[PDB]
């Protein structure tokens, strides 16, 4: 469906260019800040997909559109790019986040691109690393926000529980979470060897995360009747791909376990946060992901 942009002009500075900043004042007051990226072959009557990526804890909205690479023409010829700056250089959700309402920055900002922009309101995306991770899973956690958008793809995410370190029970601890929908595509990567948001999760900063098959089961959880899963050894086994689904929708919720790999957005090449590379490309898989789930009907 496409919006009411649909046949509006590109605002006058921005058309494949490098990505522009923009300042956006959210309507009770607080102003905030994107970078976005149009692709080369937008044309303003065609609906186009949107995919927001957000950075993790300390990074910048520059350094993600780096990290995440959505701007990359040859992984994501289609979709826009929006990267937003979280306040402090992090996102509602962390321990230290307190009464930012990021979750009201995202819907403000995709009411704002469907105004000014032909967007396909059935492929808006989000995806994060760690505190940006841990902010895409509160947005499919949040019952008006997982209905506005289609699918989900946290890296690294940090997953964040209020529960003390000494209460924090990271294989059975609740994840706060109240999908709007049935049916809601996730797909999570993580790093075996990750020392910041560990794989096994555990006590953090006062606050408790939770292990990433417990994640990963409570998701899986609510595809509820005919639920199954498959496993598949990739690269040679270093790689466990975990895809769960039921009546047909094998994947919407996917999992790959990258075995040696740190807290680190996975890249064959170097990247900010990893120097030596890792055996796949998460973008490529992730804008796949993205294609295979729209928003569905109602
Ligand atoms: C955004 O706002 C700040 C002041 O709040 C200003 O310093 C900055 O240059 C503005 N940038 C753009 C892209 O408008
Ligand atoms: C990168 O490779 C070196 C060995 O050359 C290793 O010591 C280091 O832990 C690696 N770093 C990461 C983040 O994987």
């Known amino acids: ?13 921005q058309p494949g260019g490098s990505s522009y900043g923009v300042n956006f004042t959210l309507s009770a007051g607080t102003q905030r800040f994107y970078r976005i990226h149009i692709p080369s072959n937008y044309n303003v009557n065609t609906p186009t997909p949107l995919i927001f990526s957000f950075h993790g804890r300390g990074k910048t909205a ?31 959700g962390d321990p230290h ?52 958008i289609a699918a989900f793809a946290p890296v690294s995410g940090a997953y964040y529980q209020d529960v003390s370190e000494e209460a924090c029970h990271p ?4 994840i706060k979470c109240s999908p709007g929908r049935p049916s809601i595509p996730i797909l999570e ?15 953090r900063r006062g606050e408790c995360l939770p292990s990433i098959p417990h994640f990963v089961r409570e998701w899986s959880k609510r595809l509820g009747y ?11 086994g270093n790689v466990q791909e975990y895809q769960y689904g039921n009546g047909d929708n094998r994947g919407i919720v996917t999992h790959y376990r990258i075995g040696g790999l740190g807290h680190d957005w996975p890249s064959v090449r170097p990247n900010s946060d990893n120097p030596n590379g890792t055996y796949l490309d998460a973008t490529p898989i992730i804008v796949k992901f993205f294609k295979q789930w729209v928003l569905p009907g109602s």
């Open 171 to 174: 294989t059975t601890v609740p």
């Open 189 to 203: 990567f993580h790093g075996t060897a990750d020392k910041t948001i560990p794989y096994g999760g555990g006590g």
């Open 1 to 13: 469906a496409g919006s009411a942009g649909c046949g509006q002009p590109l605002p006058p500075s």
């Open 97 to 148: 986040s307190k009464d930012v309402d990021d979750i009201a920055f995202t819907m403000e900002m995709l009411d704002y691109f469907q105004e000014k922009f032909c967007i396909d309101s059935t492929r808006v995306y989000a995806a994060g690393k760690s505190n940006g991770g841990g902010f895409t899973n509160l947005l499919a956690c949040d019952p008006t926000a997982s209905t506005r």
């Open 62 to 92: 520059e350094s993600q559109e780096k990290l995440s690479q959505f701007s990359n023409e040859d992984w994501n010829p289609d979709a826009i790019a929006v990267y937003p700056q979280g306040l402090n250089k992090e996102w509602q």
């Open 226 to 236: 005919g639920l199954h899963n498959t496993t598949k050894e990739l690269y040679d």
